[PDB]
Amino acid sequence: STNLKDILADLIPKEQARIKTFRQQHGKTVVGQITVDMMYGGMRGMKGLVYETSVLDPDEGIRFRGFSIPECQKLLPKAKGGEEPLPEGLFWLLVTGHIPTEEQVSWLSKEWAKRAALPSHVVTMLDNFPTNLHPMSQLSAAVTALNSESNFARAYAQGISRTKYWELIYEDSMDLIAKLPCVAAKIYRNLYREGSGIGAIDSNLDWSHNFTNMLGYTDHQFTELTRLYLTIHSDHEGGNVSAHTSHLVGSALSDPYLSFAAAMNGLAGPLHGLANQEVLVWLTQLQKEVGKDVSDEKLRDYIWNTLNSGRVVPGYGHAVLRKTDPRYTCQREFALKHLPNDPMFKLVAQLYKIVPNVLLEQGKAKNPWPNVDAHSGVLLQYYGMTEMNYYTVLFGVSRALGVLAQLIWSRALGFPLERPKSMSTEGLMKFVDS
Amino acid sequence: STNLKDILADLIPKEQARIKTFRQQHGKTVVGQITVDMMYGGMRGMKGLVYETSVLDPDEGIRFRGFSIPECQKLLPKAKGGEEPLPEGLFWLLVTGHIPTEEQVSWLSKEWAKRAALPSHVVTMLDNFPTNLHPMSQLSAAVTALNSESNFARAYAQGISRTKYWELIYEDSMDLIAKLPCVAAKIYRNLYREGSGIGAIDSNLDWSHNFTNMLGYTDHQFTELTRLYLTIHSDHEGGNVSAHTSHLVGSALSDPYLSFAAAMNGLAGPLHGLANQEVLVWLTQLQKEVGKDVSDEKLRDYIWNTLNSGRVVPGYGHAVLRKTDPRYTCQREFALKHLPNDPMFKLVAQLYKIVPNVLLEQGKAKNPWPNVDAHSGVLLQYYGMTEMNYYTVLFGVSRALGVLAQLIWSRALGFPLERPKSMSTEGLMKFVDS
Ligand SMILES: CC(C)(COP(=O)(O)OP(=O)(O)OC[C@H]1O[C@@H](n2cnc3c(N)ncnc32)[C@H](O)[C@@H]1OP(=O)(O)O)[C@@H](O)C(=O)NCCC(=O)NCCS
Ligand SMILES: CC(C)(COP(=O)(O)OP(=O)(O)OC[C@H]1O[C@@H](n2cnc3c(N)ncnc32)[C@H](O)[C@@H]1OP(=O)(O)O)[C@@H](O)C(=O)NCCC(=O)NCCS
Ligand SMILES: O=C([O-])CC(=O)C(=O)O
Ligand SMILES: O=C([O-])CC(=O)C(=O)O
Numbered sequence: 059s060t061n062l063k064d065i066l067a068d069l070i071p072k073e074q075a076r077i078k079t080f081r082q083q084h085g086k087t088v089v090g091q092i093t094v095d096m097m098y099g100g101m102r103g104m105k106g107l108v109y110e111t112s113v114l115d116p117d118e119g120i121r122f123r124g125f126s127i128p129e130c131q132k133l134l135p136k137a138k139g140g141e142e143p144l145p146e147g148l149f150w151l152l153v154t155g156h157i158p159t160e161e162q163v164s165w166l167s168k169e170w171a172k173r174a175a176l177p178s179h180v181v182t183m184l185d186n187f188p189t190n191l192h193p194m195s196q197l198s199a200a201v202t203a204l205n206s207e208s209n210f211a212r213a214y215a216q217g218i219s220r221t222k223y224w225e226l227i228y229e230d231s232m233d234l235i236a237k238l239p240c241v242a243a244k245i246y247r248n249l250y251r252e253g254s255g256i257g258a259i260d261s262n263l264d265w266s267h268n269f270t271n272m273l274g275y276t277d278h279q280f281t282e283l284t285r286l287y288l289t290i291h292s293d294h295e296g297g298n299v300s301a302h303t304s305h306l307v308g309s310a311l312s313d314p315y316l317s318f319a320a321a322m323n324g325l326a327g328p329l330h331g332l333a334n335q336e337v338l339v340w341l342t343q344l345q346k347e348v349g350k351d352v353s354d355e356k357l358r359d360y361i362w363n364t365l366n367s368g369r370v371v372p373g374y375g376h377a378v379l380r381k382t383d384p385r386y387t388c389q390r391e392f393a394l395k396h397l398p399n400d401p402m403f404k405l406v407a408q409l410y411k412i413v414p415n416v417l418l419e420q421g422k423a424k425n426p427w428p429n430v431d432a433h434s435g436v437l438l439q440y441y442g443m444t445e446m447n448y449y450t451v452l453f454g455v456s457r458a459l460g461v462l463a464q465l466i467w468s469r470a471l472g473f474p475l476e477r478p479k480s481m482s483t484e485g486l487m488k489f490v491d492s
Numbered sequence: 493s494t495n496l497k498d499i500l501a502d503l504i505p506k507e508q509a510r511i512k513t514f515r516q517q518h519g520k521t522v523v524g525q526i527t528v529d530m531m532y533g534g535m536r537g538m539k540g541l542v543y544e545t546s547v548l549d550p551d552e553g554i555r556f557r558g559f560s561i562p563e564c565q566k567l568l569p570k571a572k573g574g575e576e577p578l579p580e581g582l583f584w585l586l587v588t589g590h591i592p593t594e595e596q597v598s599w600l601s602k603e604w605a606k607r608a609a610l611p612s613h614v615v616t617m618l619d620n621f622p623t624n625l626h627p628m629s630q631l632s633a634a635v636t637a638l639n640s641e642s643n644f645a646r647a648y649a650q651g652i653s654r655t656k657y658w659e660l661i662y663e664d665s666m667d668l669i670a671k672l673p674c675v676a677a678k679i680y681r682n683l684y685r686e687g688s689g690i691g692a693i694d695s696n697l698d699w700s701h702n703f704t705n706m707l708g709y710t711d712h713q714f715t716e717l718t719r720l721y722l723t724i725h726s727d728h729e730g731g732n733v734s735a736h737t738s739h740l741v742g743s744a745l746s747d748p749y750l751s752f753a754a755a756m757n758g759l760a761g762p763l764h765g766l767a768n769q770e771v772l773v774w775l776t777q778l779q780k781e782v783g784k785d786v787s788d789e790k791l792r793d794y795i796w797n798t799l800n801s802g803r804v805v806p807g808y809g810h811a812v813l814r815k816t817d818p819r820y821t822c823q824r825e826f827a828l829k830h831l832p833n834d835p836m837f838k839l840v841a842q843l844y845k846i847v848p849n850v851l852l853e854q855g856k857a858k859n860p861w862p863n864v865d866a867h868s869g870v871l872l873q874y875y876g877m878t879e880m881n882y883y884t885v886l887f888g889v890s891r892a893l894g895v896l897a898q899l900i901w902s903r904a905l906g907f908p909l910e911r912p913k914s915m916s917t918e919g920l921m922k923f924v925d926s
Contacts, residue, residue: 205625306737
């Protein structure tokens with residue numbers, strides 16, 4: 059009806075049947091080869107897992123259940139006075155494969171509003187943490203401590219049918235999504251608002267709005283940016299470190315809280331969730347070095363120096379993507395729509411033109427075009443979100459949507475423990491020699 | 493000399509050269525095929541990663557740097573008045589590929605004794621946690637909060653050469669190993685010893701002994717069991733969920749603390765680190781149902797019922813192993829040596845004979861023989877370690893040794909971000925159809 063759990067109950071049998079047939083006909087079909095280099099090279103280009111919620115196409119970028127971000131911008135419900143898609147509807151899409159109605163999204167905002175209360179042990183933990191404990195650590199720790207609240211963990215220990223796993227996983231996932239802005243906002247306030255209270259959840263507000271309210275912002279366009287941000291960082295296929303970590307830990311039947319916290323520890327890594335900060339730090343050094351106002355000619359020579367030094371241009375490139383990132387494009391649209399005379403944004407715009415050509419000549423790049431992280435920092439900074447250490451928390455809150463959507467499906471489809479075979483160098487040499 | 497870091501500094505270049513040559517000659521060599529079923533089946537039998545510290549051979553079980561557990565029992569230094577190998581020496585083996593001297597192991601015990609102090613924010617967090625927060629959650633949270641202490645995290649943000657990564661990773665890993673018994677013991681005392689202090693580290697004691705002292709035990713043979721336990725659970729190749737999680741999160745350059753905490757969230761999962769408890773719970777139900785003293789004939793009929801009900805016999809089977817687990821064998825040896833007239837152990841012994849034959853006839857089993865978890869609970873319980881929820885913490889403290897050993901090498905060898913490609917069902921169907 060508007061009850062997601064019932065709609066999902068109807069979808070699951072159909073998907074189980076489809077997969078069962080496909081495995082019966084094509085289980086033994088070879089879809090790729092594993093080389094020595096793939097084993098040493100982090101499984102690069104290895105088809106490794108099934109992940110239903112999103113598929114990253116190298117040339118066009120991300121599709122959410124086969125929908126592009128432009129399609130999502132147009133189709134997904136917006137807040138009444140807003141233009142930006144609500145992350146609620148994105149989650150509905152990832153879970154159901156269907157664009158929700160307005161009423162479905164309204165129902166979901168209300169659900170998450172009612173599940174958001176933190177247990178007091180987690181409030182205490184958060185309030186006692188020192189200011190020098192990184193916000194991503196605080197998040198992960200708190201989410202792990204939330205596992206006390208887990209339906210799945212409790213029911214599993216009492217012996218529960220395999221077929222009922224997804225239901226408890228759904229319940230925990232909805233609970234975690236609900237609580238995450240409260241957790242995230244407590245961290246922000248404890249670190250940068252002298253430990254002031256996060257205030258009330260409003261049952262008539264969407265998730266992003268309750269979040270920006272608890273963060274202590276009121277600017278309507280910041281809420282709009284947050285809706286966009288939370289929508290587009292939500293999922294990036296299954297092979298990224300945070301999706302894969304959530305997937306792997308979850309495959310051992312760790313509850314959503316544990317699986318998500320482990321994902322956060324992966325997103326905290328420099329090579330996964332820190333690029334936003336790296337970009338902003340690089341832009342700041344840029345201005346410092348050549349000046350806050352620059353012609354396109356100087357700017358072109360700086361890139362070259364960067365590269366000759368053997369240093370990357372942050373925010374350009376991607377592991378699998380090979381064209382401009384649609385997550386970048388849509389932030390650009392927001393900017394030139396809402397802050398086009400922003401000096402930092404202008405630099406971001408400038409680099410868009412210049413950097414691509416360079417990286418080409420250099421050769422080594424595969425993808426000479428920008429990723430999402432090239433553009434997120436200047437938007438956030440524009441609206442007073444200046445605490446760069448905190449940025450990966452926003453990413454984390456976003457990424458819950460995609461990874462938990464998929465976790466529900468992994469349990470509904472009965473995906474088993476992920477357990478590849480490892481080899482040593484010595485072992486792999488003898489293997490090859492016979 | 494006796495400085496591990498210097499010895500490891502000498503080993504690394506040689507291994508880099510060996511791998512570089514091997515990739516140049518054999519990078520493009522195919523070592524396996526990926527099928528649709530492997531993607532749906534948790535990468536089962538997929539050669540997925542390089543993991544140097546240990547290799548699980550399906551027929552003989554685990555080798556630590558090519559040494560068996562029997563070899564390890566004989567070669568590895570023991571405590572002076574002891575017979576059981578010290579986990580210190582195991583860690584030395586995994587790190588160096590070499591059996592340490594007595595003096596090397598003594599040096600290592602002293603190193604870990606000096607690094608063990610907890611920061612006060614982690615003591616506070618632990619002391620404030622409620623009793624209904626699972627010990628594995630408490631561990632993971634505390635380890636994550638320890639990331640405040642990370643050398644690697646700090647140095648990376650200041651820009652550090654790739655070539656120096658392993659050194660800071662070593663430092664953090666040694667620090668984490670040191671602190672882990674203190675963390676683990678604080679949890680145990682807060683949960684089951686009314687929050688009494690963990691008392692002092694003794695700089696002349698080995699790690700396991702300081703650990704059993706902080707746990708509040710004095711029985712010499714418990715310390716001996718702990719040495720054995722911590723040695724044999726230390727590593728089980730790279731494809732298990734906790735090793736792989738540590739490996740994946742670590743590949744994003746998450747520090748050892750974050751990587752290990754994420755591993756713990758995976759070990760907390762029922763299908764990875766809970767089998768010990770499942771076994772004990774099953775044995776208890778067993779006695780309850782058929783009686784605490786039984787002939788081998790009744791016992792044989794119970795198994796059958798279990799199986800006809802569509803329920804597993806816990807502690808039998810393995811994902812990759814296909815014969816009796818040497819980790820099982822060596823606990824048996826300890827038992828029939830130290831507690832042979834233990835009623836629970838006798839049941840464990842009885843099941844050894846009977847269960848294998850059953851599982852055979854049933855067919856479905858691949859491995860009809862016992863794994864390590866069949867045997868750990870009765871040993872621990874025998875010595876008063878009766879809090880089953882806590883058992884996976886012991887496993888966790890053990891598993892640090894192997895996963896952190898390998899983390900050092902992954903960073904020394906410059907292993908890149910792990911990033912396989914995922915596919916949807918829909919996508920994988922179209923892929924196959926062309
Ligand atoms: C995203 C990124 C890590 C992808 O790494 P990758 O898949 O290994 O990249 P490639 O396979 O294209 O690497 C080919 C070469 O181009 C280099 N390269 C890639 N992107 C580059 C960039 N934006 N600037 C400079 N050099 C770059 C690589 O370092 C490598 O050089 P090398 O041969 O000297 O080692 C890489 O493009 C990068 O470092 N970008 C900047 C950081 C960033 O924006 N990250 C966020 C996305 S995860
Ligand atoms: C360890 C274990 C999970 C391995 O799983 P696996 O690799 O999928 O096992 P297999 O491939 O051998 O499964 C073949 C069949 O034998 C069954 N089986 C395997 N071990 C069994 C056991 N000890 N008792 C009963 N049935 C068992 C499986 O459930 C499966 O039955 P199915 O066809 O009805 O689904 C499995 O042996 C098990 O459940 N053991 C008991 C729990 C345990 O000891 N786990 C700790 C080690 S991780
Ligand atoms: O795709 C990746 O590997 C990393 C990333 O950009 C993301 O997860 O959003
Ligand atoms: O090997 C596995 O997959 C699980 C396990 O027994 C271990 O990690 O010790």
